[PDB]
Design a binder for this molecule. Sequence first.
Ligand SMILES: [Zn+2]
Ligand SMILES: [Zn+2]
Ligand SMILES: [Zn+2]
Ligand SMILES: [Zn+2]
Ligand SMILES: [Zn+2]
Lengths: 385, 353, 576, 183
Amino acid sequence: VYEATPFDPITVKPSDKRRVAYFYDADVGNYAYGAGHPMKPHRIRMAHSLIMNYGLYKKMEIYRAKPATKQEMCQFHTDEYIDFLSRVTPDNLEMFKRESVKFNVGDDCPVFDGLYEYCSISGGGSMEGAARLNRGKCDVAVNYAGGLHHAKKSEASGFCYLNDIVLGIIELLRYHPRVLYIDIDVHHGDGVEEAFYTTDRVMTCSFHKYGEFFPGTGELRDIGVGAGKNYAVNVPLRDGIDDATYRSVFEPVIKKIMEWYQPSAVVLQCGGDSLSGDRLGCFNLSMEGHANCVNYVKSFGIPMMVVGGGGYTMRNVARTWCFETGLLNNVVLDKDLPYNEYYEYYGPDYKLSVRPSNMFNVNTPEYLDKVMTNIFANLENTKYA
Amino acid sequence: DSKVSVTGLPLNKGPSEKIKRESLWNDLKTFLTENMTEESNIRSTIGWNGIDFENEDFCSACNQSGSFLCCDTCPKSFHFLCLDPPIDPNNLPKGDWHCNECKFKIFINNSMATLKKIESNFIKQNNNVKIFAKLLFNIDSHNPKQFQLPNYIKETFPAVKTGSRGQYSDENDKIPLTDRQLFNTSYGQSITKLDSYNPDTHIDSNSGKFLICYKCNQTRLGSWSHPENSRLIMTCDYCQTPWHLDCVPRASFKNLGSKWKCPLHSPTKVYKKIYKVWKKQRLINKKNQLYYEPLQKIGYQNNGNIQIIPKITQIDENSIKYDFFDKIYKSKMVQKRKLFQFQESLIDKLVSN
Amino acid sequence: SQDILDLDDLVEKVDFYLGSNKELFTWFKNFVGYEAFGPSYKRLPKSDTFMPCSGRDDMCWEVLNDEWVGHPVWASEDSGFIAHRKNQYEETLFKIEEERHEYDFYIESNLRTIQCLETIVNKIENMTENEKANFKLPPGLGHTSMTIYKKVIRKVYDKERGFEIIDALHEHPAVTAPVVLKRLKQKDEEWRRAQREWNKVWRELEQKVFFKSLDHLGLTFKQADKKLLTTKQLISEISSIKVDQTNKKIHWLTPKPKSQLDFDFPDKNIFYDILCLADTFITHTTAYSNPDKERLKDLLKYFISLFFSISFEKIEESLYSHKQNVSMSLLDILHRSRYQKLKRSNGNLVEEANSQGIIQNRSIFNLFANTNIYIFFRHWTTIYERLLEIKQMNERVTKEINTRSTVTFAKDLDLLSSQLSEMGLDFVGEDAYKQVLRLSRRLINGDLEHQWFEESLRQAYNNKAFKLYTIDKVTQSLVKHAHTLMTDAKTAEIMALFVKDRNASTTSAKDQIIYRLQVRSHMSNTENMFRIEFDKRTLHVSIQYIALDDLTLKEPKADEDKWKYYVTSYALPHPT
Amino acid sequence: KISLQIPIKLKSVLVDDWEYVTKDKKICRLPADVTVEMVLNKYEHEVSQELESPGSQSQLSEYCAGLKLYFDKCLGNMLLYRLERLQYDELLKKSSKDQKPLVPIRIYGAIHLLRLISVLPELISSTTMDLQSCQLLIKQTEDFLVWLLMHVDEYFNDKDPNRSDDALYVNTSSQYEGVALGM
Ligand SMILES: [Zn+2]
Ligand SMILES: [Zn+2]
Ligand SMILES: [Zn+2]
Ligand SMILES: [Zn+2]
Ligand SMILES: [Zn+2]
């Protein structure tokens, strides 16, 4: 069903108007990771500056969500896991030589310190965003601090120590009947999918690279078991996918999902490792090729939340999230960056544009045709909600 | 504060002349925020309050590495689950801990006379089990260990080999990538996953001819002044019949864990779903397998363990032809008779009206 | 058949065998009368789905999922997770951003604790001495973050001494807060000065490696044009299309596959530009002599004019105008003696088969070629296709270069790379394609280094025009193969026969047959044959591989033309 | 060197166990439905129903008691893979919680007893036992193995625990591999 088509530039929809809410805790960036490893909250400060210097704060309300307590964290995790996280620190690691192995919290993804603090900040941000979405206060919640899909129930893998996506999704599911999670991060969000594998009130759609690639999960046959059959949509791609290919895959699949499943609330994970030049992600998307997905989801006009995610090169993810918050305010930003504290990050062009590489797009139209045919055949069964 | 960081020098210090020589050629608006953020605690759950002998570095019970408690009289070290009883690391034994071997030796005081005396007394006590008295005594004499199958069960089946740590390796394990230690070095960037290269990928190596795909019957090579018409041929590991990654819908080069098996292998497990299990046994070599060519070939059942020729039972093409057509025609007659019973019951209930 | 395998499972397992044949498999469908489905998740026994889970309400048991487990050690088969390549220049571009993250981390943390110490000192100052005597600071110092100040103090205060000053400040703020605040202020000012005096070098080393690490297909194009442009691969691509065409012809429902290679030439001026490139190269080249140089130029010009039906005077006037704005028959060329002399001088069924089919007003022409002419025409098509790509991007690229609003605030602080604007390699707002041509000529003659030309084409054509990186090596190749048509006697005579056929305006089928036979007489049986069919109306070129017993012309559509072809090929003493 | 002749199908069962309790990361579901107490009791009972001579029945019950005592004294020491021990240890701890001592004969299934039998050649080779007693014990265990080869379709069926229930094996969680395997 794949059809290669050119990429029309992004445009702001005239009638689709909405007030958004930008959750930012002034301390999110203060905690560095151990030694230059890929994540750092720092890329949430930088983005913020741009959103401030563009005069976007006059287009929305900026909030500060009070941090999540252990009682709210445990709505997904287990107590022993949360207690261990609450008391661990680089000083008292040798005291927990067994726990660090059972919970995998002291391995390749090690604990800096402020760990519990930063996790609580992200969780509270996501949960208050979901709550304000529920209370009819706004239509969009923007939190570039959450988006930790990789954390399991009693162990953290791949840096997502607290899986705040699931806490926020439950907070949403305290009112809303059907929630649609749209993952456009290059990786597979195995945490969320595993945590909603057997339910029909949550439909996940993960556009991820498949192959011998972390987390090694997310085939086309992973379609959910039990009552959750046909309610998990994995789209496994290959390297080098580009703006026109990604658009021609995303638009029809998402339109079909929104046409048959018909969610009442959307959670969009706008991770930044699916961009060209990122430290790990092996895609070749452009900034506008990424923001087109958010524009298309917003075109539907239902309650929607925008969460952060990966992103291991701070400059591209900062510029991307700035353009995303701009597009979410119905304003196409000028590509000349105003003066900010982190001006000298974005050399040497000092422009808002992210530039794709000439990486070879390996997704042949026959493969994507077969994939989207399989996916539409699966979605045939979700017509009756 | 004077301690060097990643940059090479103290943090409060500019670049040296050597770095800047070999690296050279020759109001804001987020002042605000503490004025616009107002806290949100609109959430529903806000009610929630919220002699010096060196010890061995391998666990002598399973020969692996980790954290292990050692003995004060023998260099043997044991993990905390590999003990009798398995000692919890939270509560270590206060004082010098000794292994079962050293404990036995010190209890006997290394005198064989007391050993034979206690052995005689022990074999005298449990007369009801006199066959096992010797070993029932000898059980408390040696250190624990994990259960490794004896070689005469691993050597009965040839397709079953013990891994590097004592793990099942059933010949369906690909291979370690030895020159993939050479891969971390690599050449440049023509890496494992074979991006942008099919000169010696759409071409049979030893023969020199073309690795055709069983489903489209054309090695699509395109041109390397037009490289968007390649299709990524990969050769299976069992049959060696090569497929395109678009004919076998998979999108990857299986390179790390297993051997790729084409859709041209039958099953090796079934789940009949009404959920009965395997029909294909193990390969019992050492040349002790019973090949029995039956004297009845048209109504045999015999296994799903067939071997084809022009207890594993040989068979020929015509026998399978006849069994298959027998199945088809018997099933056709069965369906016909079902429909006929339905129609006769229907006409009976119809004339009943 | 032993009732071990389900029926639908059998149909599915057989489709992978006979699904390539629709008739066999539809007859099979009519004749036979015809949990973990995801391979990554397990199921855990429902005795470990019972964990404390302090605050889970009734909803998060009805909606969530505790049974099925998944982990990146089960789905990786205990060994895996291969990664991307990320060439070295991107690693040098990542180290820089890591350095920036570290410095910014420490700066902002020191500032955030400095503000707290400042407000603490301000609040303790205006109190009375008695209140200062007993004033204590609770853990956290009235802030929402408990760890950042401890971290910064332990960083600047020798972590043991860091803890000492932390507890001394918690117990005795009125005496410890001012001195520690002054220490943090001094350290912060020093760190900021070091930060800027290092931040110059970050940008300096980012500029020279940024574009060189967003296009590194342009280093899999200096080895993918010196290894995939050889004659072996050149004939291998066309033989591969031949093999595909043959093994798909076995499937009768597959239509008759077309010619092997197809090229289209809508824009003719690119021929003039290629001739200019060749002129400059052979003029610079010292591998060939001046008389042989002129032979090469003349052969190139004349072959292009003849094949592509371009008037020689037009090519001459175009080359002449090109030479301004920067400041004899072909048979006499093929014969070296003629060149040197002229350069010093300055039944009834067969009757009907041969009468029907004589093409009047010849518009389609043919050429029969050994390896050398084919490789030469391949080089030509490769160069024309690359230059056509560039000349099709030219308009958008010029419009884009015309909108480059350079930030002067960075230019005055020498933050922007003037080095490519120093050598004049920057693309001024003039036409881009002509600048590409001029730069390629300058590289060919040796006026400009390869790396600077590459980076100019990279900064003007951000990722789309890497192909021209070998515009030297390909040109040297093409000219070299032209030198074959001047020295290879058999290929020279084949070119002579081609000229003889091309000058003829009318031909019959038997003319084409005697043409092919006279050409094949020049080559052995071990060499291959390629037929280049040129269509003057569409300017199309169709290269066809020749099977040694295949026909000279394309398979006719009518069985009457088939019988005429058979009989006219049978009338000649050559085996049909 | 003492030698024992296990049937081939029991060798296949032991090798499939080697598969499951190794890199499929499974463990045996405990307490198994049919333990070693029940298995050895039913075997002794059925064979005594056939045995005429009193000395033969005495030797039968003697060997059966001895084998039960070797289960009790061997399951912990030499019959558990590295992956399984935590389970055993856990049960051990639960014993100390309820003050009921752990005797494996009543908990562990036939497969660990079959592992014991498999090792028994080396055990008896580590003896000073006389030749005739060793051969008598070997013959007794071989008769038992023939009984087991007849009942290997009541005892050792496979069920693929990922899809129905109550199989002879169950899966482990990630924490289980973490603690047991890689401490
Ligand atoms: Zn990710
Ligand atoms: Zn161990
Ligand atoms: Zn010892
Ligand atoms: Zn194919
Ligand atoms: Zn295969």
